[PDB]
Design a protein around this ligand. Sequence first.
Ligand SMILES: Cc1ncc(COP(=O)(O)O)c(C=O)c1O
Ligand SMILES: Cc1ncc(COP(=O)(O)O)c(C=O)c1O
Ligand SMILES: [Mg+2]
Ligand code: NA
Lengths: 400, 400
Amino acid sequence: QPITRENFDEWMIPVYAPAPFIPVRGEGSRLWDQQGKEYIDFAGGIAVNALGHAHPELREALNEQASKFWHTGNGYTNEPVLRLAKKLIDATFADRVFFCNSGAEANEAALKLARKFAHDRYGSHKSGIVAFKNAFHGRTLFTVSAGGQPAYSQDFAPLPADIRHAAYNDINSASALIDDSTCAVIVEPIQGEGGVVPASNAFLQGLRELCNRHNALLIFDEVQTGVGRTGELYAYMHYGVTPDLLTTAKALGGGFPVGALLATEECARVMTVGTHGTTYGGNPLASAVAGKVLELINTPEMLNGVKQRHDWFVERLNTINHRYGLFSEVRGLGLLIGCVLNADYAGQAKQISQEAAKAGVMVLIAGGNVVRFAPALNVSEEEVTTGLDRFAAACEHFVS
Amino acid sequence: QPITRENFDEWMIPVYAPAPFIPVRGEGSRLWDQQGKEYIDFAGGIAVNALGHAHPELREALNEQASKFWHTGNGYTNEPVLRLAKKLIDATFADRVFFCNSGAEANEAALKLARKFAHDRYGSHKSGIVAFKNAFHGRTLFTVSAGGQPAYSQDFAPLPADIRHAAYNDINSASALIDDSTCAVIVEPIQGEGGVVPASNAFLQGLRELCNRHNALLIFDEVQTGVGRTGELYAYMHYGVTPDLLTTAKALGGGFPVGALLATEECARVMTVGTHGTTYGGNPLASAVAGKVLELINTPEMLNGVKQRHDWFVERLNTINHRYGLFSEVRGLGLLIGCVLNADYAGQAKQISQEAAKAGVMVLIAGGNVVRFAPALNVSEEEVTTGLDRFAAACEHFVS
Ligand SMILES: Cc1ncc(COP(=O)(O)O)c(C=O)c1O
Ligand SMILES: Cc1ncc(COP(=O)(O)O)c(C=O)c1O
Ligand SMILES: [Mg+2]
Ligand code: NA
């Protein structure tokens, strides 16, 4: 039979309430549903589709590797995964890489590593993880425990112990929870799902200093801010603060499920044979696509084109706002942007987002108070503009 | 750029010591390395590539969805994921499914669901998970804590609490750890990684009765035993015991990263909006490939073919064994097969598997005492007979 939106409510464990309409194909930043209706996509796969939909180069790298082999599992290395490791190593502070299949898997590896590193060098008691309220790090028991949203963790207790949460951008708060017993501090350089809130340069530099004083590993969760999103390859290059461990996923594979953990030689050393692993991680199909993604994103032209796009979005969202008075602030960095709703409209992000979709434009929320834009890094000027026209018309209807 | 095996030792976090040769392509059950050497592949992707390397239909289904769209994140459903969900529902005891990226993510979803379920119907004190010594269920902190190889978890303490391990196949062992505080019992229908140990029928009925008496969810981890592996679509069907949750990954995707949680209506009801999720899970690329795998594997010809192929392997392993006296036993079901080394060859499975690679056959281990075979369910009669000739050669060298 045909497939209907009402099938989703009989067949899926109900953790999501997705859009009333169902996408069937797309190209760059346009996407179309089963009845031909056209959307401009500023969701961008939740900051994943860095190169837009059905990119011809990503396709050709896909079918080219797909016609050789897809997977053997990690008893055997492959050429694409090694080339992909080299690109990441050459391009970042990393000296070594582990590949996995999601952002949570990447953060599981990172927290595992910092645990074993501290145990091995200082002893079993040094196990403290400090993370930040409002953080999101994934949905595995360990990563959702690391996450700063107790409503996502509470139901699944007992939670792994020795995790504590400081207030984001609050140096003294973090300082109070970081002592010689801390093995890791995990922080997103911009909080993503928690509202598109960027770190300040002094906050990060202060976490770097605290980690050094207390021999703790600093982990940047760059799952959302990485691979071009901010206008440098990783947000840490923008802030100018270097972590011991950096995690990466989402846009890494331009839509193919991939993630990775980047590490210094010193940290890498501690993960000996059999101490972590993954069936699919490092397959050559993912690795061929991620390799092409990095080839295309990590160029001066694409990245400066991200800085430029930030200004086309912020200028236009600013003039929409003057006209309609929805938001108190447009914030973020590169093409991760949040519109903060005002006192009159607070908690209403999702209704604006639903209006947007009726008007032909896909936008995200980030908590009930922020409308979040995470479009393709190659969205064209014409796409930004027509998308923002439809968002204008939706703010129109919404504001009454 | 030049790529060599010594690059693996410099670029990769060193959790794997993989083969000294590097695959570059395959077709059916043959694989070829960078120098053109040819291997018969009885490792099967570690029971993932259920239809062999580079399958033309799996590439046609891949290229087809790749050219419409790959990903949106789960704010938007898609036709291939729904169709995949409905195949799974139509073919098993399930009413709903959840999609993720890996068998560990599948098992996280099932262990989370069992905990919330307990908590919501009886109170937050009912949190206990019973697993089995030598089980493998993944590398996330929660799932490696549920698996029964403490060597894989101890470095990463403190572990999530309330987990206990009973002895596999020992119903009194299980009985002593399962009580009214238990939310779940999770078990592999054949322990895979732990030696290719099949469950007995009485053992699995015993856990179903115990879970019934104590109101605990029974979870079959069919990540390895799933999707045709045993000669039935899923092992639980061979055994006539029905779980409350089943997890599936590996061969589900024929090589593409995908996994699923299969649930009855009453368990699915428990995971309400926002209580869980995943960026990549359920994308249409994965669902389009898995959809195709299910279609090609779930037929009476493939599945009976897996019964026939079991006999090819065992008839011939027996005659190798008659010549070299290596194995006390040949065990398993359909195409998961463990050859158990004799006391005179105890702990030498990996050495055997190295010799087999030298002779052009890829095989696995399952602990140091079992040689494991997990080939493609569509492996040909010629490929079986050529691979065993080489495995026989490799046995002869090994015995001197
Ligand atoms: C910053 C950050 N880290 C980790 C994750 C978990 O990623 P995944 O959904 O790929 O498992 C997400 C997803 O929202 C995220 O935004
Ligand atoms: C029975 C079983 N469950 C779960 C897993 C974890 O699967 P993955 O490596 O896909 O995360 C494995 C992998 O070895 C397995 O054999
Ligand atoms: Mg609730
Ligand atoms: Na069913």
